[PDB]
Amino acid sequence: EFTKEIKDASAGLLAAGFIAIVPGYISRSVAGSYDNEAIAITLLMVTFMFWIKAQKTGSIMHATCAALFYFYMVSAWGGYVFITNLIPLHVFLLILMGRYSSKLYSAYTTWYAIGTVASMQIPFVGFLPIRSNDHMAALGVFGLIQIVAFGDFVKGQISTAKFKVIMMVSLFLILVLGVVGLSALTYMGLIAPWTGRFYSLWDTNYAKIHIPIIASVSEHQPVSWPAFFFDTHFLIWLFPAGVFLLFLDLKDEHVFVIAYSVLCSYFAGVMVRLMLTLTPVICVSAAVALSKIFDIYLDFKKPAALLAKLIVSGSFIFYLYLFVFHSTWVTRTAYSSPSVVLPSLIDDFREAYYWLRMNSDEDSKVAAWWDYGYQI
Amino acid sequence: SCVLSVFQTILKLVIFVAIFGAAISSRLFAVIKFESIIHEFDPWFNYRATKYLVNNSFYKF
């Protein structure tokens, strides 16, 4: 559906086919894996679908649906903050490119109001949405989108180009005051500081310097180039293209996809565990690029023309079959291994744990390293 | 044409059945080769928290 909102239904089918077997998503969602990501990355796409349907159409109902699914993500995973900073950013860009409308006001204000009041109901989140830096971008775009709308009312009556820089200067002034306000508030101690992992995504050397437990877990490390292939074969070269093709024909949906792509490519490079969040956009981008190629080379509607169309389409169909094979092999070889039983079977872990369960006192306490706490 | 729309609708239904099959089949290697067990470290805790929900109540969870 999300791709069907950016180009056509054919590109949507390609995107769904890609995401179904893509090793990058498969890695954190194999049968047995029961972490938060399993359902989380599903809710993310649903939320994004409703947001785009709400932003292009301009409807209150779809913005409410987006808000409710955003609440579901807030209640499910801890990486909801990505949405909290991606939906405002898209809106902010749309203000700067001059593409403000009333559909934008309606969609964003309804999503923000319902989503924020509903995401303060999870006990873990508490009052973070109103007093934490990570959730302040949204609040900025909430206030800003109200000056701009007044702008429009007071664009029409001035009825001249005096208003052009009359608007620009006002924008700069507000933009400056707010960041200073945040800084001042943050220094005073009212607004909380950027969390201790999000800062690490900018100050790459910060983790080791202060937090010594974040730099021991393998998950939070950079990735070498081979991994961006082992996980999204063929799609990885075809994604940067799709981004350019979506850039030649800017629409609001495309502005969204472009921002998503840039930010997640940076984050995925800087940290391994954030590759999963990049896998959906890659599929969508690949789906656009291949679909565009197909649209110029599958419509058989002349020896040279037929020969060229067949050679091009056949090459890409070959790459699609190669994709299926590569993905299945990768899934079998690397991402399907159980952890409790090392293949030889070596059953030492379960054997020891069961001994501890059967031949020890029910109230006894076991002192081991943190890595094996949950398993015990 | 109505015929072309009907064809497209049926084709999409069949394509989606194929997609669901592909996804589940690719995901079941570990469950077919060893057994149905929870894998990794965090899922273990998640499993415990679900057995506590399912066995007591939503309020006590």
Partner: peptide, 6 residues
């Protein structure tokens, strides 16, 4: 990749 010490 998992929540474990390297």
């Amino acid at each position: 990749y998992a929540a474990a010490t390297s």
